[PDB]
RNA sequence: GGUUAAGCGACUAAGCGUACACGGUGGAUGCCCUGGCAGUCAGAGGCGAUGAAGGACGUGCUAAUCUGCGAUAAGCGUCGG
RNA sequence: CCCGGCGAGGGGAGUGAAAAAGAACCUGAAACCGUGUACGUACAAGCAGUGGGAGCACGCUUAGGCGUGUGACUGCGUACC
RNA sequence: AGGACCGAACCGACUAAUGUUGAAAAAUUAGCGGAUGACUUGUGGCUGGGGGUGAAAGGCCAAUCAAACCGGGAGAUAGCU
RNA sequence: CGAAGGUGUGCUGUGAGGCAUGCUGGAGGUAUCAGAAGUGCGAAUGCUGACAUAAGUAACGAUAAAGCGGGUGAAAAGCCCGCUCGCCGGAAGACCAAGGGUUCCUGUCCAACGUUAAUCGGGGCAGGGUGAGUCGACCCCUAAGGCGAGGCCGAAAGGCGU
RNA sequence: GACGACGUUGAUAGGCCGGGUGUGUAAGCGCAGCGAUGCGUUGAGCUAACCGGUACUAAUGAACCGUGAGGCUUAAC
């Protein structure tokens, strides 16, 4: 009645991928000094 | 005579969805249909819509008698998935596939 | 935690803007590259 | 181990299983049927059959007691005004619990508890 | 805490060798309406054990 | 015949492997040009205070957006085709 | 037109030479994942192949053979760079 | 009166557990220190890379510091993998 | 009236390979003999895209706390209304700034999005809404500072400054 | 998951009745005291999971699966 809406403005999902390097600490596995 | 019904681009994983389509397979359309109604799944939904739509496709655009309409064939295959993303710790970000399936239900006599 | 961006559109402009950039040389060669790179901003401007 | 104890704690603290327990009975006397899952009825009555032990018998002292254990003075006075003079030869059982289905929210385990009377 | 070798799509199976679903196969009748429904629970209609319950 | 006793045994498929048929996901390959790439030859080597390059904002019957234009605004005049 | 939520998707109908050319659109490979069918598989240890070798399924042939798939058991055998 | 005292805001940061693909690329929770001062906070400005600035730690200078980032030399060079 | 390419099957050579025709396809491909190569991949912690595995496994974001009865719709634990029950209260209530930028209000919709469903939405899509002599901005004036006619210096470029 | 009892030919759970037990003299009212408070009715009231009962409520007829006499060979009887 009213009319179903066909637009889909957001229908363009796209979507990417990203990772950031983590900080670690490996001093006492260390075996050495 | 053999009737198909499809649900193409479903919105579950084949998995489960297969996992309710395994449990009708080669059974009389009526006694499917009880089965189905009385399944707590998402998926047992989805495929009673598919399988009563092929009841009434053959009812209509083929002959008739329901009464002794058998599921012959059902299967699901994978569909397109949606790729998404879920924010994970220490700004890394991860894939998350939103998997869809194409849902085919043959019913014969 | 507080990050490094602190938005403020004062200091943007002044440190930044199209008049920041004319007011030195080098400044006008940074306009000058954008330009003819083709850069539909060129300038933090707005 | 879990043995010979009794009451279930519904993934609930103490004090939040009796305020809830407390609306509910509060519920049910005011609609006398009304629909939860399966195991917070088989609950209720635990809680609600008592309150109309207490209500068929009418002073001052049970109707304190009522009010202590439901702060409503409705839901009081509906107990000792008609629930009580309604079951007072039924010895227990004042309830009835029937399944009814699953949710389709979460697919819980829904069932009715009702007052066995409701004016039939 | 991670796997050394990828597994086989023959585990996968293996392992989903007792992920099937059962069916209920077991509809009761009701005795007045006629309708099915689950074995001690109410017909979709609001009948159990012949009478009728909710309405 | 039957009955026992001993010897032996097709019959199992929850699942799974292989082959084969047939689908789905996915986008290769072949084919094709909208565009690129390297030359050759003939020009032209500038523009701008009569306001440049580059823009902003408007303008149609419009709603963005692109293109043309500039309040004479998808345009005006004149001479030619 | 039918199912469905006046959904989505599908089944028909017509259009076209062709719709597994239906717009998620030329062809449509591989990895990947289904569904069926044939055979083998729940007392047997390991680079999973190869050499012998029953049986079964089918098609040719029609007793008998042959081909193909699958393969009990056995000899040997610890990938590549 | 006090670079007084206790103690909120506020500004810090001694300890413990937890979290470690975290709620967070250093937090949360429980305590802890100061809290009219060598105090804290807002809004502008100023000092620039062998440079700044530093109650000092090779600290900090846009989650980057025994020498920031961006672009060029530059396809630096590498008896090495 | 069936090109390349695929997908098959047979045949043939020491091999790399070739050849034939079944199917799909729908428009190209090329014996020979010469000539030129962006001429042959399985690995380089190769590169780019697709799809696996773990795996239906972990999680679903402060342990402030909910339960009924309705309504609506195709459907409601989550939407709405009512009734009680918890939580903050120098905050979790307001009011603004900075920054954002239409998120505001209203109607439709449910694909995508919302860590679940969603009938709901800061989602989509449309329409409306911001009304000032006194409030601000602009503007009068100046601080830190910046720029600075001339000027004084500095190969240029520029620096400093009345 | 399994395991055990029970489904009306029934005590399998709740409630209910009676007890037990734990706490310690409930509410209401009276009395005394200016009052706080005491006292009495009153060891009264209440009491999770305990014991002994009791069909008041819920354990529903179906249906489902599983069959129709069990290979062969010799040897005895």
Redesign the pocket.
């Known amino acids: ?11 363009t ?1 796209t979507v990417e991928l990203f990772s ?4 670690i600490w490996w001093w006492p596995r260390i075996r050495g000094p | 005579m053999e ?9 579950s ?4 969805v ?1 996992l309710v ?2 449990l009708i ?2 059974k009389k359309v009526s006694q499917a249909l009880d089965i189905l109604t009385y399944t707590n799944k ?1 998926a047992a939904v989805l495929v009673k ?2 399988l ?3 009841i ?7 002959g008739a008698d329901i009464d002794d309409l058998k599921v012959t ?12 993303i ?7 970000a ?1 894939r998350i ?3 869809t ?2 849902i ?1 239900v043959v019913v014969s006599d | ?1 507080k ?10 402009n ?2 930044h803007g199209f008049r920041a950039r004319m ?3 080098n400044g006008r060669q940074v ?1 000058a590259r954008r ?1 003819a790179k ?1 850069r ?1 901003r ?1 300038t933090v401007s707005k | 181990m879990r043995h ?4 279930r704690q519904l993934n ?2 103490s ?2 299983r ?3 327990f ?3 009975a ?3 006397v ?2 006398e ?5 399966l195991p ?1 009825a ?1 609950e209720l ?2 809680v609600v ?2 309150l ?3 209500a ?1 018998t009418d ?4 109707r ?2 009522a009010f202590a254990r439901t ?2 003075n409705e839901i009081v006075a509906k107990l000792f005004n008609e629930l009580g003079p309604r079951f007072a030869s ?9 399944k009814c289905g699953f ?4 697919n ?1 385990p829904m069932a009715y508890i009702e007052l ?1 009377d409701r004016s039939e | ?3 050394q070798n ?15 679903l059962t069916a209920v ?7 007045t309406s006629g309708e099915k ?5 109410i017909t979709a209609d609001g009948y ?2 012949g009478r009728k319950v909710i309405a």
């Open positions: 009645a009213n009319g179903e809406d066909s637009s889909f403005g957001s229908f999902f950031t390097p983590v900080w | 009737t198909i019904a499809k649900h193409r681009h479903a919105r994983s084949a998995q489960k297969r389509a395994d397979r080669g998402k819509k598919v009563e739509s092929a009434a496709n053959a009812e209509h655009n083929d064939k059902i299967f699901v295959d994978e569909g397109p998935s949606m790729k998404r879920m924010p994970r710790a220490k700004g890394r991860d596939l939103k998997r399936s194409h085919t | 935690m990050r490094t961006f602190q938005p403020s559109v004062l200091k943007r002044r440190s007011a030195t040389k306009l330009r083709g539909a060129l | 010979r104890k009794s009451g609930r603290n004090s939040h009796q305020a809830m407390r609306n509910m509060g519920s049910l005011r609609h049927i009304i629909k939860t899952t917070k088989k009555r635990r059959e008592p109309i032990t207490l068929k002073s001052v002292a049970n304190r007691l702060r409503d039924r010895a227990g059982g004042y309830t009835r619990i029937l949710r389709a929210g979460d819980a066995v | 805490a991670v796997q990828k597994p086989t799509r023959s585990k996968r199976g293996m392992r989903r060798s007792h992920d099937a196969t077991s509809l009761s009748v009701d005795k429904h689950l074995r001690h629970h159990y054990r």
